Design a protein around this ligand. Structure first.
Ligand SMILES: *[C@@H]1O[C@H](CO)[C@@H](O[C@@H]2O[C@H](CO)[C@@H](O)[C@H](O)[C@H]2NC(C)=O)[C@H](O)[C@H]1NC(C)=O
Ligand SMILES: *[C@@H]1O[C@H](CO)[C@@H](O)[C@H](O)[C@H]1NC(C)=O
Lengths: 48, 48, 48
C-alpha cells in the first residue's frame, strides 16, 4: 500500500510538470479556438 | 463635440456610426486615425 | 516617392556609433512633409 501510494503521488506530481514543460500538450483546445478565430477573421476581412 | 453618446460622425475623409469616447492609446504626431484587426476603424484623433 | 501627383518625403535622424556608416538597422522612417504637386519626374540631381 505504501509503495503504491508513493508511486501514485509521484506520478500525479510529475504530470503537472509534464503539462507545463511541454508546449504542444494543450494543442487540441487551442487548435479549435484558433481555427474558429481564423474563420471569423476571414469572414470579417471579406468586407473589403 | 459630443462624447459618451451614440452619434453619427463625419471626420476628415472618413464616415461612420458609433459611440465615441476618450481613450488612452496615444498617437504619434504623424498619425491621423487608428485601426485594428480586419482593417476596421476603431480610433480617430480629434482634428480640433 | 511620386504617385497620384504627389511627392511624399519621409525623413528620420539617426545617430550612429559604428565604423560602418550604415548601422545594422532596426530603424524606421516617419513622415515629415508632404508636397501635392503633379509633375512627371525621370531624373534627380543633388546639390552641393
Ligand atoms: C483649435 O481648437 C482649440 C480647441 O479649443 C482652440 O482652443 C485653443 O487650443 C489650444 C490647444 O489646442 C490652446 O493652447 C488654447 O489656449 C486654446 N484657446 C483658448 C482661447 O483657450 C483653438 O483656438 C483653435 N485654433 C484656433 C486658431 O482658433
Ligand atoms: C505626365 O503627367 C500627367 C499629369 O499632369 C499625367 O496625366 C501623364 O500620364 C504623365 N505622363 C505623360 C507621358 O504625360
Amino acid at each position: 500500500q505504501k509503495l503504491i501510494a508513493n508511486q501514485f503521488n509521484s506520478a500525479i506530481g510529475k504530470i503537472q510538470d509534464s503539462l507545463s514543460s511541454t508546449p504542444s500538450a494543450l494543442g487540441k483546445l487551442q487548435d479549435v479556438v484558433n481555427q474558429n478565430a481564423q474563420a471569423l477573421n476571414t469572414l470579417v476581412k471579406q468586407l473589403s | 463635440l459630443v462624447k459618451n453618446k451614440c452619434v453619427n460622425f463625419n471626420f476628415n475623409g472618413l464616415t461612420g456610426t458609433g459611440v465615441l469616447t476618450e481613450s488612452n492609446k496615444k498617437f504619434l504626431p504623424f498619425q491621423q486615425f487608428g485601426r485594428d484587426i480586419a482593417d476596421t476603424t476603431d480610433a480617430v484623433r480629434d482634428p480640433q | 516617392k511620386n504617385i497620384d501627383g504627389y511627392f511624399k518625403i519621409y525623413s528620420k535622424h539617426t545617430p550612429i556609433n559604428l565604423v560602418r556608416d550604415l548601422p545594422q538597422g532596426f530603424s524606421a522612417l516617419e513622415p515629415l512633409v508632404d508636397l501635392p504637386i503633379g509633375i512627371n519626374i525621370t531624373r534627380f540631381q543633388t546639390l552641393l
